[model samples]
Target: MADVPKREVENVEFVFEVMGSPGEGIDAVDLGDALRALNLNPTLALIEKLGGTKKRNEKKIKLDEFLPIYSQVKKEKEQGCYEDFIECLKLYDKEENGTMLLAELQHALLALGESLDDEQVETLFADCMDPEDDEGFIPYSPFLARMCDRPDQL
Candidate 1:
Protein backbone atom coordinates (compact mmCIF):
# COMPACT_ATOMS: atom_id res chain seq x y z
CA MET A 1 0.00 0.00 0.00
CA ALA A 2 1.37 3.41 -0.93
CA ASP A 3 0.91 6.48 1.21
CA VAL A 4 -1.30 9.23 -0.12
CA PRO A 5 0.83 12.05 -1.45
CA LYS A 6 1.18 14.91 0.98
CA ARG A 7 0.30 17.61 -1.50
CA GLU A 8 -2.59 19.81 -0.45
CA VAL A 9 -4.02 19.92 -3.97
CA GLU A 10 -4.12 17.40 -6.78
CA ASN A 11 -2.72 18.44 -10.12
CA VAL A 12 -5.41 19.67 -12.52
CA GLU A 13 -4.59 17.12 -15.22
CA PHE A 14 -4.46 14.26 -12.73
CA VAL A 15 -7.87 15.15 -11.33
CA PHE A 16 -9.45 15.59 -14.73
CA GLU A 17 -7.80 12.44 -16.01
CA VAL A 18 -8.76 10.40 -12.99
CA MET A 19 -12.35 11.59 -12.86
CA GLY A 20 -13.11 12.37 -16.49
CA SER A 21 -11.38 13.82 -19.48
CA PRO A 22 -12.36 14.82 -23.02
CA GLY A 23 -15.84 15.35 -21.55
CA GLU A 24 -17.65 18.08 -19.72
CA GLY A 25 -19.04 16.06 -16.82
CA ILE A 26 -19.15 12.55 -15.39
CA ASP A 27 -22.02 10.39 -14.14
CA ALA A 28 -22.42 7.50 -11.73
CA VAL A 29 -21.64 4.75 -14.22
CA ASP A 30 -18.46 6.49 -15.39
CA LEU A 31 -17.27 7.20 -11.89
CA GLY A 32 -18.30 3.71 -10.88
CA ASP A 33 -16.14 2.22 -13.62
CA ALA A 34 -13.22 4.30 -12.47
CA LEU A 35 -13.61 3.28 -8.85
CA ARG A 36 -14.37 -0.34 -9.63
CA ALA A 37 -11.27 -0.58 -11.82
CA LEU A 38 -9.27 0.37 -8.75
CA ASN A 39 -10.99 -2.43 -6.82
CA LEU A 40 -13.08 0.11 -4.93
CA ASN A 41 -16.83 -0.15 -4.68
CA PRO A 42 -18.75 2.44 -6.67
CA THR A 43 -22.19 1.75 -5.29
CA LEU A 44 -24.16 4.96 -5.38
CA ALA A 45 -26.21 3.91 -2.43
CA LEU A 46 -23.10 3.27 -0.37
CA ILE A 47 -21.52 6.50 -1.52
CA GLU A 48 -24.63 8.34 -0.45
CA LYS A 49 -24.46 6.58 2.89
CA LEU A 50 -20.92 7.87 3.31
CA GLY A 51 -22.02 11.41 2.44
CA GLY A 52 -20.25 11.09 -0.91
CA THR A 53 -21.71 12.27 -4.17
CA LYS A 54 -25.14 11.17 -5.28
CA LYS A 55 -26.95 11.11 -8.59
CA ARG A 56 -28.79 14.30 -9.39
CA ASN A 57 -31.86 13.95 -11.54
CA GLU A 58 -31.29 17.21 -13.32
CA LYS A 59 -27.61 17.06 -14.16
CA LYS A 60 -24.42 15.06 -14.33
CA ILE A 61 -22.00 15.20 -11.40
CA LYS A 62 -19.89 18.18 -12.35
CA LEU A 63 -16.26 18.66 -11.36
CA ASP A 64 -17.30 21.03 -8.61
CA GLU A 65 -19.58 18.49 -6.98
CA PHE A 66 -17.23 15.58 -7.55
CA LEU A 67 -13.74 17.01 -7.08
CA PRO A 68 -13.86 18.42 -3.56
CA ILE A 69 -15.31 15.29 -2.06
CA TYR A 70 -12.82 13.10 -3.91
CA SER A 71 -10.04 15.38 -2.78
CA GLN A 72 -10.94 14.56 0.79
CA VAL A 73 -11.77 10.87 0.44
CA LYS A 74 -9.05 10.03 -2.07
CA LYS A 75 -6.42 10.82 0.49
CA GLU A 76 -6.89 7.55 2.32
CA LYS A 77 -5.02 4.33 1.56
CA GLU A 78 -7.09 2.46 -1.05
CA GLN A 79 -5.71 -1.04 -0.46
CA GLY A 80 -7.21 -1.23 3.05
CA CYS A 81 -10.64 -0.46 1.70
CA TYR A 82 -10.29 -2.39 -1.53
CA GLU A 83 -7.95 -5.29 -0.79
CA ASP A 84 -10.91 -7.62 -0.60
CA PHE A 85 -11.58 -7.02 -4.25
CA ILE A 86 -8.24 -8.54 -5.19
CA GLU A 87 -9.00 -11.48 -2.93
CA CYS A 88 -12.35 -11.84 -4.61
CA LEU A 89 -10.73 -12.06 -8.03
CA LYS A 90 -8.45 -14.81 -6.84
CA LEU A 91 -11.50 -17.05 -6.84
CA TYR A 92 -11.61 -16.79 -10.63
CA ASP A 93 -7.95 -17.55 -11.19
CA LYS A 94 -8.52 -21.03 -12.54
CA GLU A 95 -4.84 -21.79 -13.00
CA GLU A 96 -3.81 -19.90 -9.89
CA ASN A 97 -1.76 -17.75 -12.23
CA GLY A 98 -3.25 -14.56 -10.83
CA THR A 99 -5.07 -13.81 -14.06
CA MET A 100 -8.69 -14.11 -15.07
CA LEU A 101 -10.41 -15.19 -18.22
CA LEU A 102 -13.25 -13.12 -19.65
CA ALA A 103 -15.84 -15.06 -17.71
CA GLU A 104 -13.78 -14.67 -14.60
CA LEU A 105 -13.64 -10.94 -15.13
CA GLN A 106 -17.43 -10.84 -15.37
CA HIS A 107 -17.88 -12.87 -12.24
CA ALA A 108 -15.29 -10.85 -10.37
CA LEU A 109 -16.92 -7.55 -11.31
CA LEU A 110 -20.33 -8.86 -10.32
CA ALA A 111 -18.93 -10.16 -7.08
CA LEU A 112 -17.54 -6.69 -6.42
CA GLY A 113 -21.01 -5.22 -7.01
CA GLU A 114 -20.42 -3.70 -10.45
CA SER A 115 -23.16 -4.08 -13.03
CA LEU A 116 -21.26 -3.96 -16.31
CA ASP A 117 -22.85 -5.44 -19.38
CA ASP A 118 -21.03 -7.56 -21.95
CA GLU A 119 -20.25 -4.68 -24.28
CA GLN A 120 -18.98 -2.57 -21.42
CA VAL A 121 -16.66 -5.35 -20.36
CA GLU A 122 -15.34 -5.65 -23.87
CA THR A 123 -14.76 -1.94 -24.05
CA LEU A 124 -13.11 -2.00 -20.67
CA PHE A 125 -10.68 -4.79 -21.40
CA ALA A 126 -10.34 -4.41 -25.13
CA ASP A 127 -6.73 -3.42 -24.91
CA CYS A 128 -5.66 -5.89 -22.28
CA MET A 129 -6.39 -8.99 -24.34
CA ASP A 130 -3.57 -10.39 -26.41
CA PRO A 131 -4.15 -11.46 -30.01
CA GLU A 132 -2.26 -14.71 -29.59
CA ASP A 133 -3.94 -15.59 -26.33
CA ASP A 134 -7.13 -17.45 -27.19
CA GLU A 135 -7.83 -17.80 -23.51
CA GLY A 136 -8.46 -14.04 -23.44
CA PHE A 137 -7.32 -13.86 -19.86
CA ILE A 138 -7.12 -10.47 -18.20
CA PRO A 139 -4.36 -10.07 -15.67
CA TYR A 140 -4.75 -7.96 -12.54
CA SER A 141 -1.54 -6.08 -13.24
CA PRO A 142 -2.60 -4.87 -16.67
CA PHE A 143 -6.17 -4.39 -15.46
CA LEU A 144 -5.09 -2.24 -12.54
CA ALA A 145 -2.57 -0.38 -14.66
CA ARG A 146 -5.15 0.25 -17.34
CA MET A 147 -7.58 1.56 -14.77
CA CYS A 148 -5.60 4.70 -14.01
CA ASP A 149 -3.67 4.96 -17.27
CA ARG A 150 -5.04 5.27 -20.78
CA PRO A 151 -7.74 2.88 -21.92
CA ASP A 152 -5.43 1.22 -24.46
CA GLN A 153 -1.97 2.28 -23.36
CA LEU A 154 -1.95 0.14 -20.24
Candidate 2:
Protein backbone atom coordinates (compact mmCIF):
# COMPACT_ATOMS: atom_id res chain seq x y z
CA MET A 1 0.00 0.00 0.00
CA ALA A 2 2.98 2.32 0.52
CA ASP A 3 4.71 2.00 -2.81
CA VAL A 4 3.58 5.49 -3.81
CA PRO A 5 2.99 4.78 -7.46
CA LYS A 6 3.59 7.79 -9.66
CA ARG A 7 1.57 6.68 -12.65
CA GLU A 8 -2.03 5.86 -13.35
CA VAL A 9 -2.86 2.17 -13.32
CA GLU A 10 -2.97 0.44 -16.68
CA ASN A 11 -6.52 0.25 -17.97
CA VAL A 12 -5.97 -3.33 -19.17
CA GLU A 13 -4.87 -4.51 -15.77
CA PHE A 14 -7.64 -2.65 -13.98
CA VAL A 15 -10.34 -4.27 -16.06
CA PHE A 16 -8.77 -7.66 -15.59
CA GLU A 17 -8.69 -7.25 -11.82
CA VAL A 18 -12.28 -6.08 -11.67
CA MET A 19 -13.17 -9.04 -13.83
CA GLY A 20 -11.09 -11.24 -11.46
CA SER A 21 -8.21 -11.28 -13.76
CA PRO A 22 -5.73 -13.51 -15.35
CA GLY A 23 -9.08 -15.27 -15.88
CA GLU A 24 -12.36 -14.04 -17.29
CA GLY A 25 -14.75 -11.15 -17.14
CA ILE A 26 -18.06 -11.76 -15.43
CA ASP A 27 -20.84 -13.06 -17.63
CA ALA A 28 -24.49 -12.25 -17.26
CA VAL A 29 -27.78 -12.88 -18.96
CA ASP A 30 -28.11 -9.13 -18.70
CA LEU A 31 -24.77 -7.35 -18.22
CA GLY A 32 -26.42 -4.33 -16.66
CA ASP A 33 -27.74 -6.43 -13.81
CA ALA A 34 -24.27 -7.85 -13.31
CA LEU A 35 -22.81 -4.36 -13.20
CA ARG A 36 -25.47 -3.24 -10.74
CA ALA A 37 -24.92 -6.22 -8.47
CA LEU A 38 -21.14 -6.40 -8.55
CA ASN A 39 -20.07 -2.75 -8.76
CA LEU A 40 -23.07 -1.38 -6.86
CA ASN A 41 -22.64 1.61 -9.15
CA PRO A 42 -26.03 3.15 -9.58
CA THR A 43 -24.69 6.00 -11.64
CA LEU A 44 -23.14 3.64 -14.13
CA ALA A 45 -26.13 1.32 -13.89
CA LEU A 46 -28.53 4.11 -14.68
CA ILE A 47 -26.46 5.17 -17.65
CA GLU A 48 -26.23 1.58 -18.77
CA LYS A 49 -29.94 0.94 -18.31
CA LEU A 50 -30.84 3.98 -20.33
CA GLY A 51 -28.17 3.04 -22.85
CA GLY A 52 -29.10 -0.66 -22.88
CA THR A 53 -29.63 -1.36 -26.52
CA LYS A 54 -28.84 -5.01 -27.28
CA LYS A 55 -25.59 -4.00 -28.91
CA ARG A 56 -24.63 -1.73 -26.05
CA ASN A 57 -25.52 -4.32 -23.43
CA GLU A 58 -24.19 -7.23 -25.44
CA LYS A 59 -20.92 -5.71 -26.56
CA LYS A 60 -17.75 -5.90 -24.49
CA ILE A 61 -17.07 -2.47 -23.14
CA LYS A 62 -13.67 -0.89 -23.70
CA LEU A 63 -11.01 -0.11 -21.10
CA ASP A 64 -11.75 3.61 -20.86
CA GLU A 65 -15.34 2.94 -19.95
CA PHE A 66 -14.07 1.92 -16.49
CA LEU A 67 -11.60 4.77 -15.98
CA PRO A 68 -13.92 6.85 -13.81
CA ILE A 69 -13.84 4.40 -10.92
CA TYR A 70 -10.37 3.03 -11.55
CA SER A 71 -8.75 6.44 -11.34
CA GLN A 72 -10.63 7.11 -8.11
CA VAL A 73 -9.20 3.96 -6.50
CA LYS A 74 -5.62 4.95 -7.28
CA LYS A 75 -6.16 8.46 -6.02
CA GLU A 76 -7.65 7.24 -2.75
CA LYS A 77 -4.89 4.66 -2.19
CA GLU A 78 -2.23 7.29 -2.83
CA GLN A 79 -3.81 9.43 -0.15
CA GLY A 80 -3.27 6.50 2.26
CA CYS A 81 -6.89 6.71 3.34
CA TYR A 82 -8.69 3.34 3.18
CA GLU A 83 -5.68 1.21 4.06
CA ASP A 84 -5.55 2.60 7.55
CA PHE A 85 -9.21 1.86 8.14
CA ILE A 86 -8.97 -1.71 6.84
CA GLU A 87 -5.73 -2.35 8.71
CA CYS A 88 -7.45 -1.22 11.87
CA LEU A 89 -10.21 -3.73 11.25
CA LYS A 90 -7.55 -6.41 10.72
CA LEU A 91 -6.09 -5.59 14.11
CA TYR A 92 -9.39 -6.36 15.82
CA ASP A 93 -9.30 -9.97 14.67
CA LYS A 94 -6.60 -11.01 17.12
CA GLU A 95 -7.22 -14.64 16.25
CA GLU A 96 -6.38 -13.83 12.59
CA ASN A 97 -9.47 -15.74 11.50
CA GLY A 98 -9.64 -13.36 8.53
CA THR A 99 -13.18 -12.49 9.55
CA MET A 100 -14.64 -10.15 12.17
CA LEU A 101 -17.33 -11.17 14.63
CA LEU A 102 -20.34 -9.00 15.42
CA ALA A 103 -18.64 -7.53 18.45
CA GLU A 104 -15.43 -6.98 16.53
CA LEU A 105 -17.34 -5.32 13.69
CA GLN A 106 -19.17 -3.04 16.12
CA HIS A 107 -15.94 -2.16 17.85
CA ALA A 108 -13.89 -1.36 14.73
CA LEU A 109 -16.44 0.94 13.08
CA LEU A 110 -16.52 3.08 16.22
CA ALA A 111 -12.74 3.10 16.49
CA LEU A 112 -12.18 3.89 12.80
CA GLY A 113 -12.58 7.26 11.11
CA GLU A 114 -15.53 6.03 9.06
CA SER A 115 -17.76 6.36 12.19
CA LEU A 116 -20.50 4.17 10.82
CA ASP A 117 -23.76 4.63 12.74
CA ASP A 118 -25.52 1.78 14.52
CA GLU A 119 -28.01 1.35 11.70
CA GLN A 120 -25.32 1.71 9.05
CA VAL A 121 -23.15 -0.79 10.86
CA GLU A 122 -25.99 -3.26 11.10
CA THR A 123 -26.95 -2.75 7.48
CA LEU A 124 -23.35 -3.18 6.39
CA PHE A 125 -22.94 -6.28 8.48
CA ALA A 126 -26.19 -7.78 7.31
CA ASP A 127 -25.31 -6.97 3.74
CA CYS A 128 -21.79 -8.40 3.86
CA MET A 129 -21.73 -11.05 6.59
CA ASP A 130 -20.90 -14.56 5.43
CA PRO A 131 -24.15 -16.43 6.00
CA GLU A 132 -22.38 -19.79 5.92
CA ASP A 133 -20.93 -19.07 9.33
CA ASP A 134 -23.43 -19.77 12.07
CA GLU A 135 -22.03 -17.05 14.33
CA GLY A 136 -22.48 -14.46 11.58
CA PHE A 137 -19.04 -13.08 11.09
CA ILE A 138 -17.91 -11.06 8.05
CA PRO A 139 -15.15 -12.60 6.00
CA TYR A 140 -12.42 -10.13 5.22
CA SER A 141 -12.25 -10.46 1.43
CA PRO A 142 -15.95 -10.20 0.68
CA PHE A 143 -16.45 -7.63 3.41
CA LEU A 144 -13.88 -5.32 1.92
CA ALA A 145 -14.99 -6.18 -1.58
CA ARG A 146 -18.60 -5.08 -1.17
CA MET A 147 -17.79 -2.33 1.29
CA CYS A 148 -15.78 -0.34 -1.20
CA ASP A 149 -17.25 -1.78 -4.37
CA ARG A 150 -19.98 0.81 -4.34
CA PRO A 151 -19.48 3.26 -7.23
CA ASP A 152 -20.28 6.11 -4.91
CA GLN A 153 -20.33 6.62 -1.18
CA LEU A 154 -23.42 5.26 0.56
Candidate 3:
Protein backbone atom coordinates (compact mmCIF):
# COMPACT_ATOMS: atom_id res chain seq x y z
CA MET A 1 0.00 0.00 0.00
CA ALA A 2 1.00 3.64 -0.50
CA ASP A 3 0.71 6.73 1.72
CA VAL A 4 -1.89 9.52 1.55
CA PRO A 5 -0.75 12.83 0.13
CA LYS A 6 -1.03 15.51 2.81
CA ARG A 7 -2.35 18.31 0.62
CA GLU A 8 -4.50 16.54 -1.96
CA VAL A 9 -5.09 12.98 -0.84
CA GLU A 10 -8.63 12.77 -2.21
CA ASN A 11 -9.72 12.29 1.38
CA VAL A 12 -13.14 13.95 1.81
CA GLU A 13 -15.26 16.93 0.85
CA PHE A 14 -13.79 19.36 3.33
CA VAL A 15 -10.35 18.27 2.11
CA PHE A 16 -11.50 18.00 -1.49
CA GLU A 17 -12.25 21.34 -3.15
CA VAL A 18 -12.19 24.79 -1.58
CA MET A 19 -15.78 25.33 -2.71
CA GLY A 20 -18.12 23.93 -5.34
CA SER A 21 -19.97 25.32 -8.37
CA PRO A 22 -23.44 24.81 -9.94
CA GLY A 23 -22.20 21.76 -11.86
CA GLU A 24 -20.21 20.59 -8.83
CA GLY A 25 -23.12 19.95 -6.47
CA ILE A 26 -22.49 17.35 -3.74
CA ASP A 27 -25.04 15.25 -1.83
CA ALA A 28 -25.41 17.25 1.40
CA VAL A 29 -26.94 14.40 3.34
CA ASP A 30 -23.95 12.28 2.49
CA LEU A 31 -21.40 14.98 3.24
CA GLY A 32 -22.87 15.71 6.68
CA ASP A 33 -22.50 12.07 7.64
CA ALA A 34 -19.30 11.53 5.76
CA LEU A 35 -17.79 14.56 7.40
CA ARG A 36 -17.52 12.38 10.51
CA ALA A 37 -17.20 8.96 8.94
CA LEU A 38 -13.43 8.88 8.71
CA ASN A 39 -13.47 5.13 8.29
CA LEU A 40 -16.25 4.97 5.73
CA ASN A 41 -15.61 4.92 2.04
CA PRO A 42 -15.87 8.41 0.58
CA THR A 43 -18.83 7.75 -1.65
CA LEU A 44 -21.85 9.70 -2.96
CA ALA A 45 -24.23 8.50 -0.22
CA LEU A 46 -22.40 10.53 2.42
CA ILE A 47 -22.45 13.56 0.13
CA GLU A 48 -26.28 13.50 0.26
CA LYS A 49 -26.22 14.84 3.83
CA LEU A 50 -24.45 18.07 2.91
CA GLY A 51 -27.51 19.25 0.86
CA GLY A 52 -27.05 18.88 -2.88
CA THR A 53 -27.85 15.11 -3.20
CA LYS A 54 -25.68 15.06 -6.30
CA LYS A 55 -22.89 12.54 -6.81
CA ARG A 56 -19.40 14.04 -6.58
CA ASN A 57 -17.38 13.59 -9.72
CA GLU A 58 -13.76 14.09 -8.58
CA LYS A 59 -12.18 15.79 -5.59
CA LYS A 60 -13.01 19.49 -6.05
CA ILE A 61 -11.14 21.30 -3.24
CA LYS A 62 -12.19 24.88 -3.97
CA LEU A 63 -15.81 24.12 -3.02
CA ASP A 64 -15.19 22.07 0.14
CA GLU A 65 -12.54 24.21 1.89
CA PHE A 66 -14.96 27.06 2.43
CA LEU A 67 -17.40 24.62 4.02
CA PRO A 68 -19.99 27.09 5.32
CA ILE A 69 -20.16 29.05 2.07
CA TYR A 70 -23.91 28.45 2.03
CA SER A 71 -24.36 30.36 5.29
CA GLN A 72 -23.12 33.68 3.92
CA VAL A 73 -24.45 33.18 0.43
CA LYS A 74 -27.89 33.78 1.88
CA LYS A 75 -26.70 36.78 3.88
CA GLU A 76 -25.61 38.79 0.84
CA LYS A 77 -28.92 38.03 -0.87
CA GLU A 78 -31.06 39.49 1.93
CA GLN A 79 -28.92 42.62 2.40
CA GLY A 80 -29.90 43.60 -1.20
CA CYS A 81 -26.32 42.89 -2.28
CA TYR A 82 -27.49 40.89 -5.24
CA GLU A 83 -24.30 41.51 -7.16
CA ASP A 84 -22.16 40.34 -4.26
CA PHE A 85 -24.20 37.18 -3.89
CA ILE A 86 -23.69 36.39 -7.56
CA GLU A 87 -19.99 37.03 -7.23
CA CYS A 88 -19.54 34.49 -4.41
CA LEU A 89 -20.96 31.76 -6.61
CA LYS A 90 -18.34 32.56 -9.18
CA LEU A 91 -15.53 31.83 -6.74
CA TYR A 92 -14.47 28.19 -6.33
CA ASP A 93 -16.21 27.49 -9.63
CA LYS A 94 -13.06 25.57 -10.91
CA GLU A 95 -13.90 25.19 -14.54
CA GLU A 96 -13.78 27.01 -17.87
CA ASN A 97 -15.07 29.83 -15.69
CA GLY A 98 -12.64 29.17 -12.82
CA THR A 99 -10.63 32.40 -12.69
CA MET A 100 -13.55 34.62 -13.67
CA LEU A 101 -15.92 33.05 -11.19
CA LEU A 102 -13.33 33.04 -8.39
CA ALA A 103 -12.59 36.76 -8.82
CA GLU A 104 -16.23 37.39 -8.00
CA LEU A 105 -16.75 34.77 -5.27
CA GLN A 106 -13.51 35.95 -3.64
CA HIS A 107 -15.08 39.28 -2.64
CA ALA A 108 -18.13 37.65 -1.06
CA LEU A 109 -16.54 34.62 0.59
CA LEU A 110 -13.81 36.94 1.85
CA ALA A 111 -15.78 37.29 5.07
CA LEU A 112 -17.27 34.16 6.63
CA GLY A 113 -19.13 33.06 9.86
CA GLU A 114 -20.56 36.47 10.57
CA SER A 115 -24.20 37.68 10.64
CA LEU A 116 -25.17 35.34 7.80
CA ASP A 117 -28.24 33.05 8.15
CA ASP A 118 -29.76 29.91 6.61
CA GLU A 119 -32.19 31.70 4.33
CA GLN A 120 -29.39 33.73 2.76
CA VAL A 121 -27.30 30.64 2.30
CA GLU A 122 -30.08 28.92 0.36
CA THR A 123 -30.57 31.99 -1.77
CA LEU A 124 -26.87 31.96 -2.70
CA PHE A 125 -27.23 28.41 -3.98
CA ALA A 126 -30.32 29.41 -5.93
CA ASP A 127 -28.47 32.22 -7.62
CA CYS A 128 -25.64 29.85 -8.53
CA MET A 129 -28.18 27.41 -9.92
CA ASP A 130 -29.87 30.01 -12.10
CA PRO A 131 -28.10 29.82 -15.46
CA GLU A 132 -29.75 32.96 -16.87
CA ASP A 133 -28.67 35.39 -14.13
CA ASP A 134 -25.00 36.11 -14.68
CA GLU A 135 -24.16 39.58 -13.42
CA GLY A 136 -21.56 37.71 -11.30
CA PHE A 137 -20.38 35.71 -14.30
CA ILE A 138 -18.82 38.73 -16.01
CA PRO A 139 -15.66 38.53 -18.09
CA TYR A 140 -12.33 38.92 -16.25
CA SER A 141 -10.20 40.99 -18.67
CA PRO A 142 -12.51 44.00 -19.19
CA PHE A 143 -13.85 43.76 -15.65
CA LEU A 144 -10.27 43.96 -14.42
CA ALA A 145 -9.60 47.14 -16.44
CA ARG A 146 -12.65 49.17 -15.39
CA MET A 147 -13.38 47.83 -11.87
CA CYS A 148 -9.98 47.94 -10.17
CA ASP A 149 -9.82 50.01 -7.02
CA ARG A 150 -6.57 48.21 -6.06
CA PRO A 151 -5.03 46.95 -9.26
CA ASP A 152 -1.54 46.74 -7.83
CA GLN A 153 -2.43 44.04 -5.24
CA LEU A 154 -4.17 41.86 -7.84
Question: Which candidate achieves the best TM-score against the true structure?
Answer: 1
In model 3, which regions exceed 4 Å deviation? 1-9, 13-22, 39-62, 65-154
Residue 60 CA displacement from its true place in model 3, Å: 13
lDDT of each: 0.53, 0.50, 0.39
**RMSD to true structure for each model, in Å:** 7.2, 11.8, 16.6
Candidate 1 has which clashing residue pairs, if any?
Answer: none
- Model 3 is weakest, by summed lDDT over 10 consecutive residues, at 71-80
What TM-score, over all chains together, does every model reach?
Answer: 0.48, 0.39, 0.18
Shift in Å, residue 37, candidate 3: 3.3
Model 2 agreement with the true structure over 78-116: per-residue lDDT tens digits: 333334546767876667876767676677676765465
lDDT of 1 by residue, 38-83 (tens): 4354356545543444453333555555555454445544533224
Task: Return the top candidate by lDDT.
Answer: 1
* Number of the candidate with higher lDDT, 2 or 3: 2
Model 1, which residues run further than 4 Å from truth? Answer: 1-43, 46-68, 78-86, 110-112, 131-140, 148-154
lDDT of 2: 0.50
lDDT of candidate 3 over 51-110, digit per residue (tens) = 434455534323434244332222323332334533654555556463445334444534
